[PDB]
Amino acid sequence: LRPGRIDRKIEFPPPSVAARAEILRIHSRKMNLTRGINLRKVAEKMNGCSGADVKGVCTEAGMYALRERRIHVTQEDFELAVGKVMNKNQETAISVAKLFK
Amino acid sequence: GSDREVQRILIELLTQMDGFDQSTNVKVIMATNRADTLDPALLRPGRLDRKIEFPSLRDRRERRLIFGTIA
Amino acid sequence: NALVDILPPDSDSSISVMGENEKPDVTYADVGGLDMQKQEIREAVELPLVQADLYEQIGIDPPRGVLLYGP
Amino acid sequence: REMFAYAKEHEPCIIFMDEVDAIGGRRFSEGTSADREIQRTLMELLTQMDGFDNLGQTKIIMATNRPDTLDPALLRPGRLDRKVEIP
Amino acid sequence: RVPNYEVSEKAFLLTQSKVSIEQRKEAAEFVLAKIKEEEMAPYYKYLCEEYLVNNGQSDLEHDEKSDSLNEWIKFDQELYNELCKKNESKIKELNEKIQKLEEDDEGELEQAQAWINLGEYYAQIGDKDNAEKTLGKSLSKAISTGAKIDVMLTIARLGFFYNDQLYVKEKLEAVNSMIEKGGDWERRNRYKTYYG
Secondary structure, eight states: OTTTTTTOOOOOOOOOOOHHHHHHHHHHTSOOOTTTHHHHHHHHOOOSSSTTTTHHHHHHHHHHHHHHHHHOOOOTTTHHHHHHHHHHHTTTTTTTOSOOO | HHHHHHHHHHHHHHHHHHHHHHSSSSEEEEEESSSSSOOOOHHHHEEEEEEOOOOOOOOOHHHHHHHHHOO | OOOOOOOOSSSSOOSOSSSSSSSSSSTTOOOSSOOHHHHHHHHIIIHHHHOOOOHHHOOOOEEEOOEEEEE | HHHHHHHHSTTTOOOESSSSSSSOOOOOOOSHHHHHHHHHHHHHHHHHHHHOOOOOOOOOEEEOOOOOGGGGGGGGTTOOOOOOOOO | OOHHHHHHHHHHHHHSSSOOOOHHHHHHHHHHHHHHTTHHHHHHHHHTTTTSSSSOOOSSSSOSOOOOOOOOOOOHHHHHHHHHHHHHHHHOOOOOOOHHHHHHTHHHHHHHHHHHHHHHHHHTOOHHHHHHHHHHHHHHHHHHHHHHHHHHHHHHHHHTTTOOHHHHHHHHHHHHHHHHHHOOSHHHHHHHHOOO
16 A cells, blocks of 8 residues: 555445336346336335345345246335345354354 | 365366256255365355355244254 | 277266165154154255256255255 | 275185274375375275275274374264274 | 227127026126226227127117127217227326426326326227337336336236237247346236236
8 A cells, every 4th residue: 555556545335215116127127027016115225234235135136036937026025025134144254153064 | 186086076077057047957066064165266156146044043942943844 | 099989878987876786774753853854855855856847947046065064 | 995895705805904004194285295295095095994895704803002192083983983992 | 908808808708609598698797897987988889890790789789680699788979988088088187197296306106107107098088009009109118127027017907808810929028038127026926927
């Protein structure tokens, strides 16, 4: 960090709630949803702390709908999916515990 | 010379795993005693996505069952 | 040393199938507990075997290999 | 590998490992290449001890002069079911 | 959307004379209510032509048989006056909006949405030809893939309205091209049924 060696430094924040909806929207193009589901509603159910959270929420809803055995993804799967990631996020910081044994 | 033999086998695994994808097979099951033998690329998704932990801690209802099956 | 004939890929295996000429020696009657992993392994292994197309129609792309770690 | 095979045609076999501390070593391999040589040979044992290969009339007697040298996967019961100390 | 096939279901039942006496009189009730409320006026004139030799006819401007087995059939002159008025009104209103969407650039999404409402009104009064024309202008403005599939299937439904199977069959070729462009599983179920 000495003079003239580093000249641009880019800080990255955690995501906004508008930015967190924008990542969710990319993921929905892979999936087949039902009409009438707002992803600005989902981004407000979330609060995240990284761009990492939003990718496991989209996967979980589709594993929930995989269990369902219906093609569509419904708006209730997102009640549960938001709950699973946010729960997984607290279970590695109460004793700080790793993602491994 | 001996280590370059180990590695040349592992490369083929990674490469055959890439070819293996988008197939109706289940991509490889593997286990490891510890989590400090992995390489950064082996653990990376697209080769290994899922990380199924096994805890020793388990809860009161599960020690019961496991005593119960062996009985 | 010329290519004069070809072999089918079935034969010239490293080791033959060990699931039709052998049969697992443990069933889920040893399994009581270890249910936490049971919800994750029935997703990972069994669902692409019974039908791979379940994933594809929903629009979820399938998970890859499984790593089991722990003592 | 081929010694266990011998053990399945020969009746009730008894495998005495004498004074094992050689491959008793832990994961190390931040040292020399010898520590991965240990590793290769160690993995070989586990697959034999428990798997689709299961024993019953092949027994392991393991003799060591200190047991806290070993890797804990060689302290694993049901491969080592009884731990007899002679004081 | 809703009266377009339900009136036609009851109207087919009413046409027959090879149905039960009671079933015909029950269906006649549904049809007649929906002509006056929904302004099906032109299709109703068309319907007097679909009996002829079958019975029930009791119209005031269109033919009758000597046997009327139905009396939930009636032509009134109010229907015809209403037609003239309502027609002008609906066309006038959205016309202006389309011009407003020209003046300030909003016309990609909105003008197509205006023209969809036009084909639905033209579909409501029983015109396949002119409902299709307005749903054709919806395509030209560049819109989502999903919207384009939706519109073709509406045009194909206007084929069931007159019970012309060729008219259905022809439109449903085009949707087979679009269905994988949009790629939906949602509008593919619709397609499965439409083709069913």
